[PDB]
Amino acid sequence: ARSYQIELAQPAINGKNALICAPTGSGKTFVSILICEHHFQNMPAGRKAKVVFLATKVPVYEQQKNVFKHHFERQGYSVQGISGESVEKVIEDSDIIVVTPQILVNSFEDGTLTSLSIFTLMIFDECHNTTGNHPYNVLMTRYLEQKFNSLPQILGLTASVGVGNAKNIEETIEHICSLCSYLDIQAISTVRENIQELQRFMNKPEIDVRLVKRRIHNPFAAIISNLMSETEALMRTIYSKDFGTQNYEHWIVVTQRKCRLLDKEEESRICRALFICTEHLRKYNDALIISEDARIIDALSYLTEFFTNVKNGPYTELEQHLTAKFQEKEPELIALSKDETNENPKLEELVCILDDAYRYNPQTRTLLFAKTRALVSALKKCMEENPILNYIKPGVNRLLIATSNLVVLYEYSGNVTKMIQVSKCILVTSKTEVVENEKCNRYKEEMMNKAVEKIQKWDEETFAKKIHNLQMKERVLRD
């Protein structure tokens, strides 16, 4: 048991309702089992302890059931794990119950159970969800009912308390205290006397955000985008708008399900027809994505290959047409391939990063994350045709191009800290939107920590009152 782990569990060990706030993968659950065994050890009276470990998601719930089983059954404790797949008995028999909250919620509104005195200690995983119509809030709302009128020790575990829609630290404080009021928290526990240790234990990788230039003119987009408009036009004729996006690929998968579905000779023919139209739109969509992030010779290549296969396949009247209508524009597109002037500067900086990355450490094993499968093959081609990366041979081998030693997120539109979990990281982007989100989150983190510090430095009674009063306020608006 690490020092920070033991620091974390102090207040809860000392009987207080505590909210443990510590990064994902610092072993908060272990800090919880630490608290449990000390719970059982120092339990007075003829009263017997009972512990609930609530878990938000059912995949997690099973890992925690097993982890609590594995640790405590060998020490002579009964540990059942109730799930969606009689709560009266299971609670009565067991010393430790790992549960989903909805089911505990059910058995309270169902009538089966109508007291939380049963439990001596309730552990809330991902406790920041205690808000609105999340089942923790209900459970706690009931907890709060039984508080004033006529209680288990509360422990809540979260990687982040968050900052709601706060404007400034002082508005953030109010959020955290509001949250704290919902869980009846008496203490906010974070690592202070062991920040050294905690940091070492999980090297949070520096996230380099490199905003890169995306070329000015992309008529290839326009040509193709119009071919897509026309194909959609056609499609609509047979069956009674921002292209080159994930959104569009979604719609295609959606629409393609509606068309499988659907005079069964009539039905059939509209299906084929629509399947063919969606398939072609998808390939267009793919190519648009390839062009945005790679060379235009890759996007045209991708399509040339496609239509060859269509030319070689069954080659329906509808397919003949659509190939025909593509070739009508092919010259114009073949023109933009050769340019040599109109090449992707997003790619340049990707390679430029890759060059200087392989200079400070030529023994690097780089893991490049493309935006789509079709990009991987296009990027794979590019590395094999580059004068700068003439030294390097990739893989799908000191470089690995994959899709969603060193991690390169080549245009990843989404939460980065998550993707890292699936120490050196670079997020390459052209969207300014993506770049400012990083600075927004880091800043929001900044506020949470300092907010927590400022709160942590209050007197214990001062704190209690803030919470007490806040709880009373809610109570008043729940008559």
From TrEMBL:
Record-listed ADP binding positions: 5, 25, 27-29
The keyword Amino-acid biosynthesis is annotated on this UniProt entry: no
Predominant subcellular localization, coarse grouping: cytoplasm
Limits of the Helicase C-terminal domain: 346-478
Helicase ATP-binding domain mapped to chain residues: 9-179
Record-level GO cellular component terms: cytoplasm
Keyword list, A-Z: Antiviral defense, ATP-binding, Cytoplasm, Helicase, Hydrolase, Immunity, Innate immunity, Isopeptide bond, Metal-binding, Nucleotide-binding, Phosphoprotein, Repeat, RNA-binding, Ubl conjugation, Zinc
Compartments (UniProt record): Cytoplasm
Catalytic activity: ATP + H2O = ADP + phosphate + H(+)
GO molecular-function terms, A-Z: ATP binding; double-stranded RNA binding; hydrolase activity; RNA binding; RNA helicase activity; single-stranded RNA binding; zinc ion binding
Residue numbers binding Mg(2+): 125-126
Homology family: Belongs to the helicase family. RLR subfamily.
This protein's name: RNA helicase
Underlying gene: RIG-I
